[PDB]
Amino acid sequence: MISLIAALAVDRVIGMENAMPWNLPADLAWFKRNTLNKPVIMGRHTWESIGRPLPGRKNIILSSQPGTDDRVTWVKSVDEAIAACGDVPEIMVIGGGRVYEQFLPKAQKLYLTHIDAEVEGDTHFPDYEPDDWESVFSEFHDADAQNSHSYCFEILERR
């Protein structure tokens, strides 16, 4: 099973200048909770944004070019990325925009954080078709001293 996980600001913005212009520790905790002990697939730009291997996860990087770090696994196509995960229950695709667009048709589950923040961005989550997805979990949180925007965690499953 392939899942996508992402945090989206208003208008589906997911990044700006290879970074994310919000700091929401509760959402990072959610990301860790839902990805630990699973393989994670990311594009090369997201690998450079994260800046180091994510511990406790098999890190698979998509790039057309040879890899430059043997602490992670480098693959050259979508099919190779999936195969490199082996026979696990759930593969997590962690972006960025180009990678989400290629894996969305293959995904059964979306883990989305909707952040109530107006962010100029240069990268968006794919338009997906709402009729294709059932919301199975949602949990809203007001802003607090640690998280400066309200946010909603949602899980959707392909109908």
Ligand X SMILES: NC(=O)c1ccc[n+]([C@@H]2O[C@H](COP(=O)([O-])OP(=O)(O)OC[C@H]3O[C@@H](n4cnc5c(N)ncnc54)[C@H](OP(=O)(O)O)[C@@H]3O)[C@@H](O)[C@H]2O)c1
Ligand Y SMILES: CN(Cc1cnc2nc(N)[nH]c(=O)c2n1)c1ccc(C(=O)N[C@@H](CCC(=O)O)C(=O)O)cc1
What residues line the site for ligand X (CB under 6 A)?
6-7, 14-15, 18-20, 42-46, 49, 62-65, 76-78, 94-99, 102, 123
Smallest separation (angstroms) from ligand X to the CB of 135: 18
According to the annotation, is 101 in a ligand binding site? yes
Angstrom distance (rounded) from CA 152 to CA 35: 18
Q: Does 28 contact ligand Y by CB under 6 A?
A: yes
Eight-state DSSP code of residue 134:
E
Angstrom distance (rounded) from CA 17 to CA 3: 25
Cβ proximity to ligand Y: between 39 and 87 the closer is: 39
Q: Which does residue 54 bind out of ligand Y, ligand X, Mn ion, none, counting CB within 5 to 8 angstroms by kind?
A: ligand Y
Q: Which does residue 104 bind out of Mn ion, ligand X, ligand Y, none, counting CB within 5 to 8 angstroms by kind?
A: none
The answer to whether the peptide bond before residue 96 is cis (omega within 30 degrees of 0) is yes
Angstrom distance (rounded) from CA 141 to CA 157: 21
Q: Does 95 contact ligand Y by CB under 6 A?
A: yes
Angstrom distance (rounded) from CA 84 to CA 121: 32
Helix then strand count (H, E) for the chain reads: 4, 10
Smallest separation (angstroms) from Mn ion to the CB of 126: 5
Cβ proximity to ligand X: between 2 and 20 the closer is: 20
Residue identified by tokens 């082996």 is 86
What is the contact surface with Mn ion in residues (CB under 5 A)? 77, 87, 116-117, 126-127, 149
